[PDB]
């Protein structure tokens, strides 16, 4: 017995301000059933498939976000973009470079088999012009395509190396769509 409850320390992890117990509890049960709470704090140890599970759950709760002034938003959703930056950076091999400019034309070509029916270069440059559903489709497709070892050197250099920051810039406006 004796309060077999979480300590206050367990809510603190590497991203400052993020309440990790609240993140764990907010994620859908199909994610939290299949990870541990310490997994959220240590992407480097997590398998590629489990990173993708976590990232998809983050997109889901970012889509279903509370108001920006809600305490839940301040402790969880506000930090999802940095959290995804970290998980995507580790997924892709950790050699991301913010001095690179993401090649929108190449990324547009990469998306043709999946999103070709509606995606545009203008949407890719200005994600706030997309709807909530369009952003979620793009984020989900990025997670699906992402790999620990890129099979195309040009896509890696020109797209995946800037993708943690590009993804962060796409999921951020999702948090403020009504």
UniProtKB/TrEMBL annotation:
It holds the Pfam family Tenui_NCP. InterPro entries: Major_non-capsid_tenuivirus (IPR006960). This is SP. It comes from Tenuivirus oryzaclavatae. The gene is SP.
């Amino acid at each position: 017995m004796q309060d077999v409850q979480r300590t206050i320390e367990v809510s603190v992890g590497p991203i400052v301000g993020l309440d990790y117990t609240l993140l764990y509890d907010t994620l859908p049960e199909t994610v939290s059933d299949n990870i541990t709470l310490p997994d959220l704090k240590d992407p480097e140890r997590v398998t590629e498939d489990t990173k993708k599970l976590i990232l998809k759950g983050c997109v889901y709760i970012a889509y279903h976000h509370p108001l920006e002034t809600d305490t839940l938003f301040i402790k969880v959703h506000k930090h999802i973009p940095e959290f995804c930056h970290s998980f995507l950076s580790h997924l892709l091999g950790g050699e991301d470079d913010d001095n690179a400019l993401i090649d929108i034309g190449l990324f547009f070509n990469m998306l043709q088999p999946s999103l070709g029916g509606w995606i545009t270069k203008n949407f890719l440059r200005h994600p706030n012009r997309m709807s909530k559903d369009q952003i979620k489709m793009l984020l989900d497709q990025i997670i699906k395509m992402a790999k620990a070892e890129s099979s195309d050197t040009e896509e890696y250099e020109k797209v995946w190396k800037k993708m943690p920051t590009y993804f962060e810039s796409i999921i951020q406006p999702l948090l403020h769509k009504t």
